[PDB]
Design a protein around this ligand. Structure first.
Ligand SMILES: Cc1cc2nc3c(=O)[nH]c(=O)nc-3n(C[C@H](O)[C@H](O)[C@H](O)COP(=O)(O)OP(=O)(O)OC[C@H]3O[C@@H](n4cnc5c(N)ncnc54)[C@H](O)[C@@H]3O)c2cc1C
Lengths: 665, 9, 133
């Protein structure tokens, strides 16, 4: 906390200048360490100010007003720093009360495809910088993949659902600006096998712990062992998990082998000893007869006859010495074998029941990545890890849509308008859209720049749902192809009554087969109403899309009965089922790092497109086609705050281009 | 991505 | 730097379970069989050793010779000298044996005897005849 808290809650190192800061302040960062601290302080302090009160615009005046000497002594610096921050949506983004009502006439004109959060976020900024902004949206509502089901008092999201921690999350600021009811999610998650019975704490804990052990293992294969290509194909996470489980099975056997191999080594030292013992009890038997016969010769006897008795006597006790030392040895081994035979190593690596619960953990992962682990990149699936927010995940109790809708306020949004063609050239762009309702009723939009926020599922369609004229450069279309666009679905169950443990937010269900680990594997209790929400992940996700709503809600009830009793589970009053892969304005749910891709492709996605010149030999043009969206933010893919940020990013980059960058001197 | 995982350690 | 604790993953073993499509299940069968083999081997030698034990039943109890507890003397009765000469012919230099056969002489007296009578009991001749066997 302090000014350093701000830096952090703004995703920036508090005592270092960033790459994007060096870009606009090369004079400072290439200069003396003393000025850098002033910069960093002015930056951090302005942030704090904006953050402490994100409901009202923060102006250059108000900023200098609240600064101290020696910091408020140089006012060009303060002005640059403040201008920079404003431009890149670090201060004054979202929904604030503007002090200086909007500058009367606008400069430049931007068409924005899609009113997802990335669109909306960018739109607002552009408008704030005084540009002419218009959004084209194919749907009859805003918010795209932030969808929210409403009916009566029932409220459930079919899209984004969780705020993944406020620590550094832009959505932290947005929630102070907008009434979202933010409820903590309690970490506890009971599983329930196919039969209907809790997996017991002993197992529950030892399968999980193996799961986590198994992830770390794959990471070790990747980074330390370099196991990343396999017959030219790049290795997936799925493959790697198999290769690790195999090597764990192999070693389980490897152990058994050398354990029994120790029994035969010892059970066979025994054999050789008993052979020696049977052969001694033999010579003893016979030597006794001899000595017996020598004592039958009654006295008086001569000396050799006396010697004989005496000799055979010694000879016999000597051989009774040995067969006594051997019974000693025999006694050692004989027990050193009840040793080994009593503490056997592990029977199996994981049983069928075990392996089935591990599958639910993999379902968890296939849900988190919205895809079959066989599609994820081993090296990179978790490349976005360092940037995780801190603090408890939350849900939006009043429904997530509440946020798009808030942001859409004051904006030129054309709903039911499906872009079909984007035409960009050295002098400008036209966008050709149609009316989704009567699809021959055509529209044309002329602008300085297009911000494209099409979902990557959309950008992938073959054959194309949107045509680029001219076609996008191969570097971009290869990024589109390489990248992964997964799928994940929701079933909403609306009841007259809570029949579940009200103090539990989520409870798993374990499938029967690997093939179906995804199917209704998880259930959420989040809302004020009695709604229950069930995920359909992994391979199951895509196959369940081709199945009727009834059948789905069937298997849902089935499972719940199993867990709760065949008559605590009423008929559901209202039910909904998401089908994201089939939804033509999404074509999927969110992106993942596919095998063969990397985080760098996300950067390729965000790079703007610059047309060739009109008259050949004319100067290099301005860039015209820009990109935002969840698939374009390397450090925050697949999320709301991620899209939001990418929106801010482009808004800045467009304004720098068309309204010019006064602050860089 | 990872952060969406239920039951984090 | 190293695997998690209790996970096992050697560079070598990874390469072996990857070198083709079913080098996985192959390797896990050579071991599933190597096991079955060693397991029946155990039972066989358990069976062998069980029948070798039944032959040792009773120990050597009907063959033990009661403990003779006699006091070490210093005089060589003519009887004892004669026992000795024979003990030599049949035990060479094993002074412990000789001392036991005679009964009432210690390993050292027995040693001394070798020197004291060497001439009179041609112990040279005797000892060389224990060698020719
Ligand atoms: C099931 C599910 C659960 C999720 N849960 C979370 C979560 O818990 N937490 C989290 O942070 N994120 C979550 N996400 C992801 C998050 O929803 C998205 O990354 C984010 O909302 C994407 O916003 P966007 O602006 O990039 O794309 P979108 O919101 O899809 O915006 C694209 C817009 O373009 C429109 N469009 C498409 N084609 C055309 C065209 N032809 N012409 C005009 N308009 C067009 C679409 O209708 C849409 O409005 C989840 C996603 C899914 C699918």
């Amino acid at each position: 906390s302090g000014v350093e808290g701000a830096a952090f809650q703004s995703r920036l190192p508090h005592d270092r200048m960033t790459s994007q800061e060096a870009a606009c302040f090369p004079d400072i960062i290439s200069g003396p360490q003393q000025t850098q601290k002033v910069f960093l302080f002015i930056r951090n302090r302005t942030l704090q100010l904006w953050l402490d009160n994100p409901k009202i615009q923060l102006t250059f005046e108000a900023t200098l007003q609240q600064l101290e000497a020696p910091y408020n002594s140089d006012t060009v610096l303060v002005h640059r720093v403040h201008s920079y921050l404003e431009r890149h949506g670090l201060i004054n983004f979202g929904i604030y009360k503007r002090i200086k009502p909007l500058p009367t006439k606008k400069t430049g004109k931007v068409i924005i495809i899609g009113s997802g959060v990335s669109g909306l976020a960018a739109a607002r900024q552009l408008q704030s910088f005084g540009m002419d902004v218009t959004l084209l949206e194919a749907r009859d509502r805003v918010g795209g993949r932030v969808a929210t089901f409403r009916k009566g008092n029932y409220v459930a999201d079919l899209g984004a659902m969780v705020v993944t921690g406020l620590g550094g999350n832009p959505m932290a600021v947005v929630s102070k600006q907008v009434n979202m009811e933010l409820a903590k999610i309690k970490q506890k998650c009971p599983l329930y096998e196919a039969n209907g019975q809790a997996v017991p704490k002993e197992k529950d804990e030892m399968v999980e712990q193996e799961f986590n052990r198994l992830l770390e293992a794959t990471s070790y294969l990747s980074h330390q062992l370099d196991f990343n290509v396999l017959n030219n194909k790049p290795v997936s996470l799925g493959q790697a998990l198999e290769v690790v489980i195999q090597l764990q099975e192999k070693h389980v056997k490897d152990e058994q082998i050398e354990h029994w191999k120790k029994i035969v080594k010892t059970q066979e030292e025994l054999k050789e000893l008993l052979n020696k013992m049977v052969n001694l009890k033999e010579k003893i038997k016979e030597l006794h007869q001899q000595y017996k016969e020598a004592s039958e010769v009654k006295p008086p006897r001569d000396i050799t006859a006396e010697f004989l008795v005496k000799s055979k006597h010694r000879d016999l006790t000597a051989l009774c010495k040995e067969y006594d030392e051997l019974a000693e040895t025999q006694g050692k081994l004989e027990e050193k074998l009840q040793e080994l035979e009593a503490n056997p190593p592990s029977d199996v690596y994981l049983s069928s029941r075990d392996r089935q619960i591990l599958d639910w953990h993999f379902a968890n992962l296939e849900f988190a990545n919205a895809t079959p682990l066989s599609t994820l990149s081993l090296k990179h699936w978790d490349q976005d890890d360092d940037f995780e927010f801190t603090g408890s995940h939350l849900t939006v109790r009043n429904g997530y849509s509440c946020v798009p809708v808030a942001l859409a306020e004051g904006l030129d949004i054309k709903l039911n308008t499906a872009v079909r063609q984007v035409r960009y050239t050295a002098s400008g762009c036209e966008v050709i859209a149609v009316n989704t309702r009567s699809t021959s009723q055509t529209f044309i939009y002329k602008c300085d720049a297009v911000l494209c926020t099409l979902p990557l599922g959309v950008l992938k369609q073959q054959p194309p749902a949107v045509q680029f004229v001219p076609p996008l450069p191969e570097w971009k279309t290869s990024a589109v192809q390489r990248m992964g666009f997964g799928n994940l679905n929701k079933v909403v169950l609306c009841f007259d009554r809570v029949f579940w443990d009200p103090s539990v937010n989520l409870f798993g269900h374990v499938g029967s087969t690997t093939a179906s680990r995804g199917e209704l594997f998880l259930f959420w209790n989040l809302y004020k109403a009695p709604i229950l929400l069930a995920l359909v992940a992994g391979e199951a996700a895509g196959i369940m899309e081709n199945i009727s709503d009834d059948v789905i809600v069937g298997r849902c009830l089935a499972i719940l009965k199993g867990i709760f009793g065949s008559s605590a589970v009423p008929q559901p009053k209202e039910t909904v089922v998401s089908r994201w892969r089939a939804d033509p304005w999404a074509r999927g749910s969110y992106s993942y790092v596919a095998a063969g891709s990397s985080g760098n492709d996300y950067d390729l996605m965000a790079q703007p497109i610059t047309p060739g010149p009109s008259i050949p030999g004319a100067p290099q043009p301005i860039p015209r086609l820009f990109f935002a969206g969840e698939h374009t933010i390397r450090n925050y893919p697949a999320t709301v705050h991620g899209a939001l940020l990418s929106g801010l990013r482009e808004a800045g980059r467009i304004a720098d281009q068309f309204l010019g960058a006064m602050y860089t001197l | 991505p990872r952060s969406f995982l239920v039951r984090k350690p | 730097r190293k695997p998690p604790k209790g996970m096992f993953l050697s560079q070598e073993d990874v390469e072996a379970v990857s070198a083709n499509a079913t080098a996985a299940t192959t390797v896990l069968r050579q071991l599933d069989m190597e096991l079955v083999s060693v397991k029946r081997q155990i039972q066989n030698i358990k069976q062998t050793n069980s029948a070798l034990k039944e032959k040792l039943d009773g120990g050597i109890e009907p063959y033990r010779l009661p403990e003779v507890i006699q006091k070490c003397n210093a005089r060589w009765t003519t009887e004892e000298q004669l026992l000795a000469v024979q003990a030599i012919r049949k035990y060479g230099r094993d002074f412990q044996a000789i001392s036991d056969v005679i009964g009432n002489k210690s390993v050292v007296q027995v040693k001394n005897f070798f020197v004291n009578y060497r001439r009179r009991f041609n112990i040279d001749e005797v000892l060389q005849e224990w060698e020719a066997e």
